Paper text:
Dystroglycan (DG), a ubiquitous membrane receptor belonging to the glycoprotein complex associated to dystrophin, plays a crucial role in the stability of the plasma membrane, especially in skeletal muscle tissues where it is highly expressed. A single gene, DAG1, encodes for a protein precursor, which is proteolytically cleaved in two subunits, alpha-dystroglycan (α-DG), located at the extracellular side of the plasma membrane where it binds several extracellular matrix proteins, and beta-dystroglycan (β-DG), which is a transmembrane protein that interacts with dystrophin in the cytoplasm. The molecular structure of the N-terminal region of α-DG (α-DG-Nt) was later determined at high resolution by X-ray crystallography, revealing the presence of two domains, an immunoglobulin-like (Ig-like) domain and a domain similar to the small subunit ribosomal protein S6 of T. termophilus (S6 domain), connected by a flexible loop. Noteworthy, it has been shown that α-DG-Nt is necessary for recruiting LARGE and some pathological conditions that are caused by missense mutations in the DAG1 map within the α-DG-Nt.
More recently, two additional mutations, namely V74I and D111N, located on the Ig-like domain surface facing the S6 domain within α-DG-Nt, have been found in a seven years old compound heterozygous patient, who displays mild muscular dystrophy and asymptomatic hyperCKemia. In particular, we focused on the murine α-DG-Nt region, fully validated as a model for the human counterpart, carrying the three pathological missense mutations V72I, D109N and T190M that correspond to their topological counterparts V74I, D111N and T192M in human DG. The crystal structures of D109N and V72I have been determined to a resolution of 1.70 Å and 1.80 Å, respectively. Similarly to what observed for T190M, residues 50–58 and 305–315, as well as residues 163–179 (V72I) or 164–179 (D109N), were missing in the D109N and V72I final models. That said, both D109N and V72I structures show the typical overall folding of α-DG-Nt. According to the refined crystallographic model, the pathological mutation Val72→Ile has no effect on the overall conformation of α-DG-Nt, but in this case also the local effects on the structure around the mutated residue are quite limited. On the contrary, the single mutant V72I shows a decrease both in Dmax (from 90 ± 3Å for WT to 80 ± 2Å for V72I) and in the Rg value (from 25.20 ± 0.04Å for the WT to 24.20 ± 0.04Å for V72I), pointing to a more compact shape as compared to the WT protein. In detail for V72I the profile is mainly unimodal characterized by a broader single peak: even if its maximum is slightly shifted to more compact models with Rg about 21–25 Å (60.4% of the total population), there is an increased fraction of extended models with intermediate Rg around 25–30 Å.
Residue numbers in the entry: 59 to 162, 179 to 303
The structure:
Amino acid sequence: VPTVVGIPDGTAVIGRSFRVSIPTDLIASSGEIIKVSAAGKEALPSWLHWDPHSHILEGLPLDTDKGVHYISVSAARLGANGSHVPQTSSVFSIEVYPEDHNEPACAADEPVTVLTVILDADLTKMTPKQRIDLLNRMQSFSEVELHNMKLVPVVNNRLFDMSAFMAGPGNAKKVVENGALLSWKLGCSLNQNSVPDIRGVETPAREGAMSAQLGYPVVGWHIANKKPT
């Protein structure tokens, strides 16, 4: 008598890490083969990665991933002739939303103080796991958890923010790629005198230790107050 497993729908935010556990032990009895894909395709959406050993589906969506993604979790039996005999399939969806509003909140009308690191990188050339690994490797410096950092592409080729009230240089002398912005929240309506200690960002950025850990050149960093939502 076959068992039916429903998986709940999820949500993701452009430029924020996405991570969910998939209940494979419920779906695959009797040593069956699990496949996780976009529904009706063999591959996942470009922003997702499936880790079969931890049972984790994870990703980092870009602007072009906005919208609903249906995900099929299937179990197949391997036949004596090597064929995969499908047994069951469970489909859920993930809706990618456009904006995290710079919030992992601040009062309304209260600007959010954001620290941004500008990287010589092109996120559209990076796999989902590479995007997550880059966020992981920033944790030593930000002291913010992976899921509370934001990672998005540079737009209109702007490698600077003229509203920033603190900033400094990285190790890069040239910028070869389009650029990526890796940012996090410091607080609400801060100024130079209430910003926390940032020597653990600014010194490794300038000396090259941050780029050596992240795997990408650092163009610079800045701190600026961003309009709410």
